Symmetry: C3
Subunit: 421 residues, 3 copies
């Protein structure tokens, strides 16, 4: 049996009082990871090569995820059965070196570690013909699925409350990669086309986006004994809300009281990202991110995001170092023009089973500090039925109430373990 996974777990305290807290800017889709994670998360994989004959082989892989709050010993939970697929390599003579697979599978995800941000991820149930050799590069083809909670109607109503049927969305993906545009660099290009796939007779709301596009282009340059990635992405409509490759063409959301409300995503998104990790000499390592994301919706509720941070590691011993992370966020509401922002600074002393910023297990002892000043928030007060502004960006003092995290401070500290195997 093969055994792999990821897991993080720990214990912490908040400067002001009680269990530890985590800090994320209202409107941003991420937080600066170090000494700013508040869960025990864990994926346990058990795979195995079940048959081999020369070049031909069949591999079986599975994944079961657990997420608990780590406030107690016995903590019951509903695990997620995230992957169970079979991949057969070299089984098709004519297209050599390629694989065909079917089943639930995490499929070629692209992410940014220090902010735990996945920027191109279409995993889920699916199937595909992977790694076909096109000479100048490798070309892969796949189809995956997602399905939104409700959003379709059995008959034609004018009442959004009748659109409660789960609505399926398909994604068709095509990538061309490992092209050496330059010396040291490579270029990957991909096209994603998604669409809500309606049951015979069902109907979507009026004006629902329905389908959409995501265009990705990623360049990898080898540098300072490490690397640098520069991405640029462009999304359209039903692909703007998730923004990783998955489609939500129905435009209907739901309150905690089962009331349907309208999230319509016609619009577009533009992403410009650059991240990497470089080694400078023998005693330093350092990861870094810089991103600007702009979701512009017709519905006028989009946002414009900016981030930057760096994680420099300095090594006393081959297995003892001092890590430091500094991050800055700033989100501006499309609807109101206000701006929310924050900055965090963490200081940690770790012991890892490695000599790299990328090596783990790791055992940290840290201290984090954050100061934010938010001037807007989302209005989730009331009910999708009571409230008409339900789920819209609204200023910090809108109608004498108060939205957003405010303008304060805080510091937390503790011990943590993190590890991929």
């Amino acid at each position: 049996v093969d055994f792999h996974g990821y897991a993080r777990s720990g214990i912490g305290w908040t400067g002001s009082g009680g269990e530890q807290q985590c800090f994320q800017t209202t409107g941003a889709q991420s937080k600066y990871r170090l000494g700013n994670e508040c869960e025990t998360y864990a994926e346990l994989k058990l795979g195995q090569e079940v048959w081999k004959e020369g070049d031909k082989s069949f591999y079986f892989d599975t994944n079961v995820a657990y997420s608990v709050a780590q406030q107690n010993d016995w903590e019951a939970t509903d695990p997620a059965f995230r992957e169970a697929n079979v991949q057969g390599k070299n089984l098709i003579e004519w297209l050599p070196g390629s694989t065909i697979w079917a089943g639930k599978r995490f499929y070629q995800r692209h992410d940014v570690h220090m902010i735990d941000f996945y920027y191109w991820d279409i995993s889920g149930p699916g199937a595909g013909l992977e790694n076909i050799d096109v000479g100048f590069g490798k070309l892969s083809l796949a189809a995956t699925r997602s399905s939104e909670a409700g959003g379709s109607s059995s008959f034609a109503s004018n009442n959004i409350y009748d659109y409660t049927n789960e609505t399926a969305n398909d994604v068709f993906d095509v990538r061309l990669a490992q092209m050496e545009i330059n010396p040291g660099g490579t270029l990957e290009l991909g096209v994603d086309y998604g669409r809500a796939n309606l049951r015979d007779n069902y109907r979507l709301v009026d004006g629902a986006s329905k389908d959409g596009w995501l265009f990705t282009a990623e360049h990898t340059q080898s540098v300072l004994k490490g690397f640098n990635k520069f991405v640029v992405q462009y999304a359209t409509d039903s692909m703007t809300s998730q923004g990783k490759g998955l489609s939500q063409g129905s435009g209907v959301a739901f309150d905690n009281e089962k009331f349907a409300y309208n999230i319509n995503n016609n619009g577009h998104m533009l992403r410009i990202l650059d991240h990497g990790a470089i080694s400078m000499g023998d005693n330093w390592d350092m990861m870094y991110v810089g991103m600007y994301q702009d979701i512009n919706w017709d519905n006028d509720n989009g946002t414009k995001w900016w981030t930057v941070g760096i994680r420099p590691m300095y090594k006393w011993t081959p297995i003892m170092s001092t890590v430091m992370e500094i991050g800055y966020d700033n989100v501006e509401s499309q609807r109101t023009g206000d701006k929310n922002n924050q900055y965090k600074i963490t200081l940690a002393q770790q012991w890892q089973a490695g000599d790299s910023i990328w090596s783990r297990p790791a055992i940290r002892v840290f201290a984090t500090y954050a100061k934010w000043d938010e001037k807007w928030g989302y209005d989730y007060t009331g009910n999708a039925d009571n409230n008409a502004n339900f789920g819209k960006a609204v200023p910090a003092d809108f109608n004498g109430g108060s939205f957003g995290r405010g303008d304060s401070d805080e510091w937390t500290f503790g011990a943590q373990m993190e590890i991929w195997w």
Copy 2:
């Protein structure tokens, strides 16, 4: 650690629209498997031989099942802890080669793959003395348990709504097998006696079946480089409803509104089955089933079922083939004399890690087509309290409403993976 299991997973589309659908005749207890399965199901076993001394050994086995809808990546679920038992072989000098075991264990199940139909299965918590050598054959003894949701009353009421206590049922099993009645053939005989085991003072409903019998006789003949099984079974009363060896002597069911209703199973069942797989030459393999099942209940709500289908595999390469399945069902209501029926035809191109119809992993790409015409259905409209005909067979247009699947068509298609290890 030992690692074994079963798992199936995939992606599909319905000709008419949306996610894929599966087809099963109303009244039949099975569907023709190929390109007609709509879940990600998976059992993960982790066992181990914990002690051996010569002939003596102690084996530890466990099983944990997962079933999700494969419409998304993160799909939480409550797993079933299905087996955790210990078997010790040769530990009793006097009866050599035999095992004694205790714990939850799948125990000697007999099924029919293409229709995924288990026809003799009494697994659950239990214990037994297995494989005693009686000279002309092997004789095994076991006791397993089941318990129905409610069905007993603390005091004597006349109101069925007072019969809500979980009611336990025990099964006592005896089999005599591996007897060579003829050359190439073998004969197994088994007797099952089950009964509801009431708590001190509790009482069952008036007229409740209470106990019952299942008699099995299975002949296996070696043929065409494969085999053929011919079964004949006979059940009585509290063994007719489940019809695999488990007992339900209480006769009380429950609506989705927690209202008790009366399912009384006094009557009998007669099963005549013949299935097998044969190889004809070097380029063809083919599985086949033929069955006739008649449940006759006093309560007049039984049914009379008929099935036939064949799955012929033709192999282009030692690892690439074209499979085809064709199935026919026809169920007639005891209560109304009407008949429901259907026929399915699937065509698939697979790649397996084998050269057999029985070998897997397998990766299929298929298309299925079905046409049914149902003339009756079960009335589950209303409430066990609102409705008096709750859960009874009723014609297709009974009281202007409509029961059954109707008289239509459909075709689906997709990709799937399936594998036992």
Copy 3:
């Protein structure tokens, strides 16, 4: 992959009728284990040494628990994700042979097998520096966490029903062990200090205990080819209710109707324990316990407990024996002075993969008998709101109703498997 666990599973019957029952004295915190367990419980561990360099190594461990009722095959359940931690040994040059760890981990538990009683157990999320060599003995340091369901208020109310916020408690532990006070004996000493850690601004009830102490001293003497432990413990206030090392300084409980009620634990506890297992010759083994526990609360609802039992094993063969267990309990209510008591006698014939009372797998076939006479019970009738005596000790006939198990008899029997690996 490393694979370990514990698991017990089986099938049983009650003399009087139905599934088997288990017997525990009202007020006692344990039952005499043999042929007196009614669940399928199982922990499945999968660990692994992920990196080693000479003396230095990093170990990864995990645990997932399942508990089902064994009344059926398919039994769904919510598993508990109990441990996921990383321990790195010898990573700190200056303090050699010591480990530093972080994550959810079972940490140095001390228990009493025949009564399944854990008397010093602070496991949960946490971190620590383990096994520092202090010359005359080994000194370890750790901090673990727990959190009670509710018990804090956002503002200052006088209504206990406003104290519904989960309230966290930290524990700080220090032990000094492996000191050879005498020849053959050793001495461990430990101090535990726990306290509810309130969020900025939240408040506890008036008079809430808040914090507390647990003092442990355990002496182990090597004897009769086995051993003997003699413990003495002393707890104070917020450590008296759990009484194993975990803190509950809030004093607020909840009915099944979400109504807060007051459990206040100011008081103290005194524990005197002596247990062990000895071998006498070659044909006998025998475990034994003797304990006296007195929880004295200001609130006057404490109890005074007494137990004694012995489990003598006599071995026919190196792998076939006859086990016997005899236990006696007697609890007296602090509030009413009444006394509850019981005695059990079990007789079993087992087959184990060992020659010891401590060796398993084991497969038992047994019969148990118990006779009790309880004269008081807890009043859980009504609601924390309806009832004012909710949850208090009350005599057996208080207000014409009836509390406690009464004065009866019973006998059960069956087969079971049990195994740690």
